[PDB]
Amino acid sequence: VKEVLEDFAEDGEKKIKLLTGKRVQLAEDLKKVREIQEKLDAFIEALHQEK
Amino acid sequence: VLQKDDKGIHHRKLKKSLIDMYSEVLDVLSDYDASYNTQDHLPRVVVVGDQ
């Protein structure tokens, strides 16, 4: 069983096609778009310092 | 239009001075409260001297 679990742990496809039920994926976008949010707001404040 | 130029692009280094905006900040604190307590909220240089 430990051997099987290790083999499945290394298998990325098995993780993709098993244990997919959590809602964390939705939250990953909420957190990742923070870089876009920073670049855009900083660019707008740069439009405001220039004009 | 001249007032807009002062507010926005005055095409001169003086434009968008951050001390200039602090002067208005302190003036509006004074307007909020005649009493000293709230005027003491924000920094300024107070000069006292012998008569």
Among B3, B23, B15, smallest CA distance to A51 is for B15
What are the tokens at A7? 């083999």
Instruction: Give residue B46's Cα distance to chain centre.
Output: 14
Is A4 exposed, middle or buried, given 0-12, 13-18 or 19+ CB atoms closer than 10 A? exposed
Q: Name the minimum distance, in Å, from the CA of A51 to any CA of chain B.
A: 5
How far apart CA A19 and CA A12 sit, in angstroms, is: 12
Within an 8 Å CB–CB cutoff, is residue B15 touching chain A?
no
Size of interface A-B (CB pairs under 8 A): 3
On whether the CB atoms of residues B42 and B26 are closer than 8 A, the answer is yes
Q: Which helix (H) or strand (E) holds B18?
A: helix B18-32
